[PDB]
Amino acid sequence: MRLDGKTALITGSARGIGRAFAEAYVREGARVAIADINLEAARATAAEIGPAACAIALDVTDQASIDRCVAELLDRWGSIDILVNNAALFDLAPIVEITRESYDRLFAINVSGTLFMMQAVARAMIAGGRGGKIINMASQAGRRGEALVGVYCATKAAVISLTQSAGLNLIRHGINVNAIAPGVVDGEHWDGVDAKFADYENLPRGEKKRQVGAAVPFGRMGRAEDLTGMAIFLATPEADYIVAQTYNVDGGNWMS
Amino acid sequence: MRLDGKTALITGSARGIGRAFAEAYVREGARVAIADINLEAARATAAEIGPAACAIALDVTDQASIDRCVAELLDRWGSIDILVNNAALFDLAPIVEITRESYDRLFAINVSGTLFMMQAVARAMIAGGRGGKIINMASQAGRRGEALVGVYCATKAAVISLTQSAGLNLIRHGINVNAIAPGVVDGEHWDGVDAKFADYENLPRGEKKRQVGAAVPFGRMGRAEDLTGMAIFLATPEADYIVAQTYNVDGGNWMS
């Protein structure tokens, strides 16, 4: 019970890593909110997790949806103790092929979504008068640029920047802001991603995903379970002195 | 004449640092384009600099304006050898006071403008078949976040990221992409900026501009003349092996 009697809002937690954190958080005695743009999947996951989880519709790109979300949880819980900006989108393409739609969309969700979601919750925490914890999800992509991932990389670099700015600015109110930077995490999305690289680099279908996983010092592609420990640690008082940091949990993929 | 017989498009060069680069490039024997959103000012500076400089209206936030600018210059010069993305906006405010309006502009001009402007000129350079030089303008603000400069810092962090992604992707076509990161450059704009900080941190009017200047290791605030040397160098062949780098020219304000 490392998170006993605490409330956590996790964005884009209907599936993937977001769901993992939710399950882990609940296991530690915390009440979580499965926020997602599709209320169907949200309710499904929330019901699958138990009485400790509840669903709620959220479009991080829409201010109205953001203010509704926060106000509703405030009445159901009385206070939001932890916020995990997990909602994000991925895409890839060389410089000369980047489209305005790719740019517009990734920045709207990855950057804009994280920022205003932070602002909404931070304003509540300040009012609450008892601080809180905010964890952003960066990525190794945000540490260094890549030839075919310009747009995605740039959004993650921005997240790291915002974590530092928010961190220094909000710590005075007792709010810790830090981020976690995963490396290469397995998931179904790798089917198409691999196809993309295979086509962009003249590589056999499936070679890319193989190369990537073998290049990880640890010796394998990431897993959600590799991240939950840190997700929990940063939310405990044993981390009260950790401010505006981005911790890499990537099996050695990148060293910071 | 280190840039003899070359052409350079410099965005937002009607005034400030952008104008200093243009005057310097013209001194090294190059033909330049004073691109600005205000053609009145653009023409004025072009006439002031001489027969080597021409004016042209450009709004880096509008694809149409971007394509027209490149096409026109291609007819006038035949090729664009150098592109300096200098156009940018500055703004500051605590997290809880950041407006969508502030976010929208800065990202539109500082990030979006740099990316698509890069793509347009890169396309031309690749078609040209003889490569080229691209120089982005970063900032110390892109190296680490600040409490009251969240938006601006995030945009510059994204620039550094885009400079790396483009650098790695375009070097294969003979195009060098790098960035310059100035520290605190003196300006009139500092009049209002100082007022802002003075009001935000309970400081005497003018104390902020003083403190910042005194904190620079070198012993004084930046000047446009401090940056021209690096601007020229990165466009010469002595920098052909320099790829995807961001060089700080800040008198020691930040170390990389």
From Swiss-Prot, chains A, B:
It comes from the Bacteria. NAD(+) binds at residues 15-17, 36, 59-60, 86, 152, 156, 182-187. Inhibited by DTT, N-bromosuccinimide and iodoacetic acid. It is an enzyme of class 1 (oxidoreductase). Induction: Induced by growth on D-sorbitol. Its EC number is 1.1.1.-, 1.1.1.16, 1.1.1.14. GO terms for molecular function: galactitol 2-dehydrogenase activity; L-iditol 2-dehydrogenase (NAD+) activity. SUPFAM superfamilies: NAD(P)-binding Rossmann-fold domains. Keywords: Carbohydrate metabolism, NAD, Oxidoreductase. Optimum pH is 11 for substrate oxidation and 6.0-7.2 for sugar reduction. Signal peptide: none annotated. The active site is at residue 152. It catalyses: keto-D-fructose + NADH + H(+) = D-sorbitol + NAD(+); galactitol + NAD(+) = keto-D-tagatose + NADH + H(+); L-iditol + NAD(+) = keto-L-sorbose + NADH + H(+). The keyword Oxidoreductase applies. Catalyzes the oxidation of D-sorbitol (D-glucitol) to D-fructose. Can also catalyze the oxidation of galactitol to D-tagatose and the oxidation of L-iditol, with lower efficiency. PANTHER family: 3-OXOACYL-[ACYL-CARRIER-PROTEIN] REDUCTASE FABG, SHORT-CHAIN DEHYDROGENASES/REDUCTASES FAMILY MEMBER. Belongs to the short-chain dehydrogenases/reductases (SDR) family. Homodimer. May function as a tetramer in vivo. This is Sorbitol dehydrogenase. It comes from Cereibacter sphaeroides. The gene is polS.
